[PDB]
Amino acid sequence: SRETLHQLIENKLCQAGLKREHAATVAEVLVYADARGIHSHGAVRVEYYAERISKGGTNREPEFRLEETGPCSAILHADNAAGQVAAKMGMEHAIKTAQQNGVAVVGISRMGHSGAISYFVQQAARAGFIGISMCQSDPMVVPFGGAEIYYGTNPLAFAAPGEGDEILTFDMATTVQAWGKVLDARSRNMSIPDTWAVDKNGVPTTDPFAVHALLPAAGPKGYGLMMMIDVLSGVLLGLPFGRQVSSMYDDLHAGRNLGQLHIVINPNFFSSSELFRQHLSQTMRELNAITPAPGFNQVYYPGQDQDIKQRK
Amino acid sequence: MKISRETLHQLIENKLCQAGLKREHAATVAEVLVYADARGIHSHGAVRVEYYAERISKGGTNREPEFRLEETGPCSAILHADNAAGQVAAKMGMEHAIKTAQQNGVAVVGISRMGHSGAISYFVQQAARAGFIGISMCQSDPMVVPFGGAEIYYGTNPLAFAAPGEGDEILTFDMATTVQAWGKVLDARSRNMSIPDTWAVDKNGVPTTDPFAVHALLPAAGPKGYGLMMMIDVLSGVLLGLPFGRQVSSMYDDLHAGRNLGQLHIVINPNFFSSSELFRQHLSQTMRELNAITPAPGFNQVYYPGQDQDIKQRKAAVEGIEIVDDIYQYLISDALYN
Ligand SMILES: NC(=O)C1=CN([C@@H]2O[C@H](COP(=O)(O)OP(=O)(O)OC[C@H]3O[C@@H](n4cnc5c(N)ncnc54)[C@H](O)[C@@H]3O)[C@@H](O)[C@H]2O)C=CC1
Ligand SMILES: NC(=O)C1=CN([C@@H]2O[C@H](COP(=O)(O)OP(=O)(O)OC[C@H]3O[C@@H](n4cnc5c(N)ncnc54)[C@H](O)[C@@H]3O)[C@@H](O)[C@H]2O)C=CC1
Numbered sequence: 001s002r003e004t005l006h007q008l009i010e011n012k013l014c015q016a017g018l019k020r021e022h023a024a025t026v027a028e029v030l031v032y033a034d035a036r037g038i039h040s041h042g043a044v045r046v047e048y049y050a051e052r053i054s055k056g057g058t059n060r061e062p063e064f065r066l067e068e069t070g071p072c073s074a075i076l077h078a079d080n081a082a083g084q085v086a087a088k089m090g091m092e093h094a095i096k097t098a099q100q101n102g103v104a105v106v107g108i109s110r111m112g113h114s115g116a117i118s119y120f121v122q123q124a125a126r127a128g129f130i131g132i133s134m135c136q137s138d139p140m141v142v143p144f145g146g147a148e149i150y151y152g153t154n155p156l157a158f159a160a161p162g163e164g165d166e167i168l169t170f171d172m173a174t175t176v177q178a179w180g181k182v183l184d185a186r187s188r189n190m191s192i193p194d195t196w197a198v199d200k201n202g203v204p205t206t207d208p209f210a211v212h213a214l215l216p217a218a219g220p221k222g223y224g225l226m227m228m229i230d231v232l233s234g235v236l237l238g239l240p241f242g243r244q245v246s247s248m249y250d251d252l253h254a255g256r257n258l259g260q261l262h263i264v265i266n267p268n269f270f271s272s273s274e275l276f277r278q279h280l281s282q283t284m285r286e287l288n289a290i291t292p293a294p295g296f297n298q299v300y301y302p303g304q305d306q307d308i309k310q311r312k
Numbered sequence: 313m314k315i316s317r318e319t320l321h322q323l324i325e326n327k328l329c330q331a332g333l334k335r336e337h338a339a340t341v342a343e344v345l346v347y348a349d350a351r352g353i354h355s356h357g358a359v360r361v362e363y364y365a366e367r368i369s370k371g372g373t374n375r376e377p378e379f380r381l382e383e384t385g386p387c388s389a390i391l392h393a394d395n396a397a398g399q400v401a402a403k404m405g406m407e408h409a410i411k412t413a414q415q416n417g418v419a420v421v422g423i424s425r426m427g428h429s430g431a432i433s434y435f436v437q438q439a440a441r442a443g444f445i446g447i448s449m450c451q452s453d454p455m456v457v458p459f460g461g462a463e464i465y466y467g468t469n470p471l472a473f474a475a476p477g478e479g480d481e482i483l484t485f486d487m488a489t490t491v492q493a494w495g496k497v498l499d500a501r502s503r504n505m506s507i508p509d510t511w512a513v514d515k516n517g518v519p520t521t522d523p524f525a526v527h528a529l530l531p532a533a534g535p536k537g538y539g540l541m542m543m544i545d546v547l548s549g550v551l552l553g554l555p556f557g558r559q560v561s562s563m564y565d566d567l568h569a570g571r572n573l574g575q576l577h578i579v580i581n582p583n584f585f586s587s588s589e590l591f592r593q594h595l596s597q598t599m600r601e602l603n604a605i606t607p608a609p610g611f612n613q614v615y616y617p618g619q620d621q622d623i624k625q626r627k628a629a630v631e632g633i634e635i636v637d638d639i640y641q642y643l644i645s646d647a648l649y650n
Pocket of ligand 2: 615
């Protein structure tokens, strides 16, 4: 069960170094990923996290400092704490701030990997607000037209509340595919589609063992989106940016120094929250009623495929 | 033909003024249009004036809007635009966003009930010129199938971003959420070429190479563009209590009726997070480093995002802006439309 795995991972990470409360938080986010089929960011990471913690490449005793910079802005100085802990804490502050003052823009400064980041925007939506989040990731992607890596798979996530317990959740890597698909096609020795990745010369490739770098989604569009995310979650916070961003296997003894940015918007500072939620539910219904194209059994609203996998 | 920036501005300004816009409003509309043309975004340039003139004439764009700025919090506002010209409403709202982020760090400003606002990167460039990060997005005419779908719901719903580098350097990025903007289907309609099958679908949701058989556009990157246009509809439409999704008006529904569109600006003042000087240095460093990346076979250069358009804008300052001669002919003429 869910509370089973939480207890497992909570225990394992608590003994590898983390305060019990920190272990409980990382556990939760990891399960969340596997359940929604986001396996690249689920348990395939758990022994690894345990290692980095034991070796100090993730801070077991971070000195957190939430620095408020304005009525609707803050930086959580996270001291290279586990990303799941840091990002969750900053989102709690963003939610509190948007609750009172309407909007919140909160940077997470110096954290480890934070995982399937839709977890954090769901926090905002469960509180009745719109959540947007994005973060830097290991340099892994060619600029459009390029043969050298610069940005990472730099994800973007969004959630908004509908009626009752309904939430619409959207989450995407800015590459054609997440990296975890390249490794999957490496392990099963499959070939990969030629739209996913390039070789050491920047030429598209079908051999996942000849992959030097991922391609950006929609060419120049994914390129701009990952740039935007690097500027918003990295440059804005004065952190390393672009190619300077650390990679997971550079040094298990050193903090990652990653950044993440949350933006939270309280609907009642703009219009009726009741009608907002009614209209989100209406969006979800209407999209579901759309005539599917040949080949599709249904049209899903964004994220519904994951919402479904979750409950099964 | 190529033409100056000041002259095109004047032509557009006069033509919209005689349609019935206040000269102040017609000026603002004109500079956003010339901005688009200079950057090569011609589908949102002077080509739209004749349409605008008709809508203004027939009352579908408010020539006497009662603007009302409703401040809802320290960093939030709605500009009620009373179906004023979008370029006017969006710029006014961005001026408020800039002022708000200057004093309070961040601003989220809705433009509620406006006409078409054009190449929306104009508005984020305002923020970047003021030293801030600008993000903007707006609803558009239903024209796009959901991923997996065969009926239209969302529009080409654009997203734009700009941030300042050192000096007058700005990094500007601006995209429709479809594989291609609608103008590419219109352009290949004008010259009778088959389009690739990744752009659009027929009435049945089957991808098509026949531009006259196109019923709807496809979202960029499948479900990703789908999610992005939904996000933009939610942020610039649902959030403002406006018509959303398939309810959004289309350009030729009713020329006598206000469009009721929505747009959302988000402005972030880097000074509220870290040194704005080092921020600008790092944006300029980003642009340099991306330019120095080894190009892949086929390419002669790696561009930083938006650099292709910056180059066009730079060239247009030298040689002048290229527009279709037919548009020049209409702008000098005494005809408002037809
Ligand atoms: N350093 C980090 O933390 C990173 C984390 N990630 C995460 O990994 C995950 C990667 O996601 P991707 O492979 O790009 O996702 P994807 O391509 O499978 O799907 C993207 C989005 O579209 C939705 N979607 C997909 N198919 C759909 C359909 N048929 N109908 C309606 N909606 C549909 C998904 O639910 C999801 O919200 C994300 O959770 C992302 O946050 C990714 C990169 C880096
Ligand atoms: N209702 C409205 O007002 C709407 C307005 N629009 C506008 O129409 C325009 C749509 O543009 P798209 O067709 O998506 O543009 P696009 O596909 O040509 O390019 C998108 C972005 O990527 C950049 N880019 C493209 N190729 C590049 C390269 N090789 N290197 C570096 N950067 C590159 C562009 O400069 C641009 O910033 C936008 O200005 C948008 O604001 C679009 C839809 C609706």
